[PDB]
Amino acid sequence: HAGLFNLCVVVLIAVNSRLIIENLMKYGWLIRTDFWFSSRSLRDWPLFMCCISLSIFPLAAFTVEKLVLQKYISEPVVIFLHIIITMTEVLYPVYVTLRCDSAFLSGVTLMLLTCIVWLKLVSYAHTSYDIRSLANAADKANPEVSYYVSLKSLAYFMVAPTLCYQPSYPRSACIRKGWVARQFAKLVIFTGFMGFIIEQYINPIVRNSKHPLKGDLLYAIERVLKLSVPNLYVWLCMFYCFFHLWLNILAELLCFGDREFYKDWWNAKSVGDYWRMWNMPVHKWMVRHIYFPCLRSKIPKTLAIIIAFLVSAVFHELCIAVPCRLFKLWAFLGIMFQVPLVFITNYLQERFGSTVGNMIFWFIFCIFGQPMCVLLYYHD
Amino acid sequence: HAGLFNLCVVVLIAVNSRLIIENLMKYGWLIRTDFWFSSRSLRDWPLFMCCISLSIFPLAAFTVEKLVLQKYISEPVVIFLHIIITMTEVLYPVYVTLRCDSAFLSGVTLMLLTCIVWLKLVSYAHTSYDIRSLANAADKANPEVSYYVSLKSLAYFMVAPTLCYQPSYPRSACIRKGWVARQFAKLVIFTGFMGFIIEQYINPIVRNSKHPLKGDLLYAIERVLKLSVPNLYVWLCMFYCFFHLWLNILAELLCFGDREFYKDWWNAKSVGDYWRMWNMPVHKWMVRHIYFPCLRSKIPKTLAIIIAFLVSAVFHELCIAVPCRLFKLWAFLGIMFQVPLVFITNYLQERFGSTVGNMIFWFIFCIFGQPMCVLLYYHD
Ligand SMILES: CCCCCCCC/C=C\CCCCCCCC(=O)SCCNC(=O)CCNC(=O)[C@H](O)C(C)(C)COP(=O)(O)OP(=O)(O)OC[C@H]1O[C@@H](n2cnc3c(N)ncnc32)[C@H](O)[C@@H]1OP(=O)(O)O
């Protein structure tokens, strides 16, 4: 069934083929300019070696786990230590990306690694607290603790493309190395295709006069789809590069038991259905750590969805607005608009059809969607 | 998996949304102009009532079958009658479409119905000859002949969307009438989408100065993909309207046992593989009536593929060049170019990959393909 997905790059080689064949070798006129990392030689940036400076805090979580598992201090004190460790995870890399500053894309990938490491840390803390509360009911404890293997399990969880820590993981085989290279080659060519389609389509169409949109929109609703359809293909190729290619490569090199991350997000009859569908690991993180602890007792789901999307709004604002240090709160409000939207398109999809719900999903994803974040990300 | 197919009409509503919302009601400024049939009222054209004048020749085939099955004359004489009946099937509707002439699109659908009725007739003759040769080995014969039910079986085969006659057919249920209407509604909106995408994309891009292509092509290879990508979407929507919608509707109203016509043509690693794949009934007709009678004895496949594509070239030329009565032989030579092409891309696909074979298939289908027939069909 893969040829109709395959046709979407045939028509991108085919339309403006001429501006594809004017390059010398591997986009010789557009190299290290789009999806760019300047000075590929040496490749030593003081935030790139500070991308491994956030790895001393998983070691700090292992030291406070060693304090509570060798009975150095009580459980509440360690919980406070986890709270301060994951708030230093907020406060320290924003100080890294403001003071002794660097490029915007390096700041964006540092904030994305900060967000992913924060989820991985909070999931490690919640799973360690759950297995400590399970193990303290009886006097079984844990003989043969194997702190090298626990260190390797925590570090292997930190490089893993999932956000749910277990000490025992499903594994696979790493004998297919030509496949790994083929996926990497597919990723690099798409990256070059990403830079080509950003420089040829979005960059001449954003670089003009623009105005902030209002409640009334007369003769201005044609721009929010015409400047969003190449952004729709940019987000589709971003999804294919991250969730189908890079996460599958990082699953394969670490020998992961499930390449399960992307799951059926194109047949979304509504958003809300879409946000529970579009990636497995962060949706498993919300249904394991925030929504379902709210749904254990005394909070219903009709504020749990708002507080889960509030912390997702906080993560998107920390990912986008902080490396540009402008504090727009446009991705915050643009995804806070989605939270009444999930409820709306559910009232619209009731007494209706799934097909026209998918039509209005792709319209919602066109205008008030995730390519809007890339549009505001290429508007600074 | 249907949402990624569904996105291709979201991006067509989205790009030039403005020229979609300037119409009054059901394309009020472009109605009965593209995919047009003038004078919808009365709807009585002298070739439209001559579209049922080709139905007296299935009755003629039943009369000559009644002559041979009631032993009025020997088998060879009836075979000659079948030969003249299906050559009057060639010679009479071209006289209908030249003398007392009509519109070009009515001539194109009359020639398409002529081609389909010719295949259905030759398949009926070959299957009747095969069951007559099977029944004449012993003295079983056929008690309870049921000539009303044989008449209904032949007529039901003539309205059926398959080209292989059997007296016993698999059936289904016709209780889902809201589904039938939904598919018909999907077909009509796509037809309107077809007329919209033909008038907005192909018609301003063909109506200019054009030149015949040669062996050397310098600074002219960008036109044969840029004027072919909207033609690629026109042929994709033509395939979806005919083989997925209209043939499934005609399967459902006649209660057919298999909606099997389209089969996996998008993952074509080569042409030749593609021509055996793109539709079930005409490919079953070639492998049941022309190729495999050649492969019974004394002819190898290395002229059988050329003679099968020669008669397919004759059918495409009779479909396209005869209603425009210009005798270009450009669709003839453009599909005679494909016959060395199937062999070529098979030598190219050997010692190679299936993925880059699919890449070069979609390049071949872009330039020297079936949208070229629609490009020359909208160039007169
Ligand atoms: C050192 C570095 C190493 C790096 C390594 C590589 C990287 C790591 C790799 C990968 C990690 C991620 C990389 C990218 C991260 C980027 C940063 C961000 O964080 S961007 C965040 C954007 N925002 C969101 O994603 C919001 C997500 N929101 C949601 O998932 C949902 O909307 C949610 C949970 C808030 C609401 O879910 P509703 O639609 O499900 O809820 P309802 O109405 O209540 O229905 C619940 C029912 O759904 C069914 N259901 C269907 N599927 C289900 C499932 N999978 N699990 C549970 N229930 C499911 C069940 O019936 C369930 O109810 P019953 O549990 O039975 O009571």
Ligand SMILES: CCCCCCCC/C=C\CCCCCCCC(=O)SCCNC(=O)CCNC(=O)[C@H](O)C(C)(C)COP(=O)(O)OP(=O)(O)OC[C@H]1O[C@@H](n2cnc3c(N)ncnc32)[C@H](O)[C@@H]1OP(=O)(O)O
């Ligand atoms: C009153 C009106 C009512 C109307 C009702 C509605 C309408 C009716 C509805 C629908 C009818 C159609 C409507 C449209 C008609 C438009 C007009 C036209 O005619 S346009 C014609 C365009 N031209 C073609 O379509 C050329 C088609 N060409 C071919 O099919 C092939 O290219 C062919 C047969 C000429 C060559 O086939 P290679 O690729 O198969 O041959 P290899 O190299 O030899 O391989 C053969 C092997 O392939 C495998 N194979 C795979 N699939 C197979 C299969 N399905 N059958 C048999 N073998 C198959 C088997 O291994 C086989 O060998 P082993 O038979 O085992 O010895």
